Amino acid sequence: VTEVLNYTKSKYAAPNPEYFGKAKGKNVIYIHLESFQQFLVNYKLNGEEVTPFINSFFKDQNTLSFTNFFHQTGQGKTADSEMLLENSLYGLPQGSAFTTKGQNTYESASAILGQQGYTSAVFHGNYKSFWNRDEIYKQFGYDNFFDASYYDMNEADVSNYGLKDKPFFKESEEYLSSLQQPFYTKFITLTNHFPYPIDEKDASIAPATTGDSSVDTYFQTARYLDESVKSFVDYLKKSGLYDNSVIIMYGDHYGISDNHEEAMTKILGKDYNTFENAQAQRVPLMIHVPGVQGGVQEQYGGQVDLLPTLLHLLGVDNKEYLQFGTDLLSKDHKQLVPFRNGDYITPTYSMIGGNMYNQQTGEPIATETKEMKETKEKVAKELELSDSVLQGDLLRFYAPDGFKKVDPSKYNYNK
Ligand SMILES: [Mg+2]
């Protein structure tokens, strides 16, 4: 109740002077890389790079790239990722939080940044009823929701899950250019979605040769996404948004489940056991902050840490908000990444499937020490306190002093 707030502050990580406020006043552009796993980065299928542009964006001067960034989603899949990004809250242990907690009071990024005059918007090539986004986005405080109704949904431009990504970015330039700055936006892509079907040739790369169809055509839809993103970034550079915004590319969750051990063994080269599968849960995080020296960031982290990381870059102190994540650029950030099912990843030891593993060598640890038991309970506590917020709707009874709550009745996403 006030218990959650006490845990939050004690966990709070002070801003890093080198990165604090360096992007204050800038726009924010989230690029949602659907089902995009980190191992795809710099991966070469039969000689050539699978995702060439993203690989270059990864190496760029002004790009903070994360190699130990893990997704913390559950049965909510993509919805849970949004929950982690917007509120720094975990999803439910079971089922989707978006569907059952659409009535809850939230104090999300749209609301927090809205306090400074930011304009909110979400772009998605599918209808707003999907994942109950239409309802819960109002509680988040998203000013605009550009769903499928704002796009040309002809049969040739539409896959199984909605509008293809290349038309999606192309057609959304109209809306983004006329959106009041400064803004806070997120572009949810669709094409790279299981079982990853692509008809030739939207595709521009040969499929893998493992014998597993869903795994083989994954690399094809990944490049289709890569090509469309490049086209979108090219637009951002022409319109000047590229220098005036913070571009953040991230993955929401895994792309290949653990029911493809044989194929994944050929892909990664090593045996795809339970350990290597947990390591495969890495998803990309690339933060392009204009006029800031970037580089590879190997500190361990999760999606829960994304919002407080962004806030510190924008020069916004979030000490008083109910957020379970910490600033990734902070030196006080502790490298501990909880999974939804109770598991966790630390640089030294990791619990996977309830069993202990050496994170660095992959070899099982027979006996469990105190510190391995201690962090196990720290993780369970964090997950429980997060559920306490969702299950009890605790944000009705709390808010930071200067903060103003959202009136969801004042939002309409229809045209
Ligand atoms: Mg997804």
Residue numbers in the entry: 230 to 644
Authors' description from the paper:
Lipoteichoic acid (LTA) is an important cell wall component required for proper cell growth in many Gram-positive bacteria. The LTA primase LtaPLm initiates LTA synthesis by transferring the first glycerolphosphate (GroP) subunit onto the glycolipid anchor and the LTA synthase LtaSLm extends the polymer by the repeated addition of GroP subunits to the tip of the growing chain.
The overall structures of eLtaSLm and eLtaPLm are very similar (root mean square deviation = 1.4 Å for Cα atoms). Both comprise an α/β core and a C-terminal part of four anti-parallel β-strands and a long α-helix. The purified protein was digested with chymotrypsin, and peptide fragments were analyzed by electron spray mass spectrometry. This analysis showed that for eLtaSLm expressed in E. coli the catalytic Thr is mostly phosphorylated (73%), whereas only 2% of the protein purified from the natural host is phosphorylated. However this modification is likely a mimic of an enzyme-substrate intermediate. As the crystallization buffer for both Listeria proteins contained a high MgCl2 concentration, it is likely that Mg2+ is present in the active center in our structures. In eLtaSLm, this surface groove is constricted by Lys-306, which form a hydrogen bond with Tyr-483.
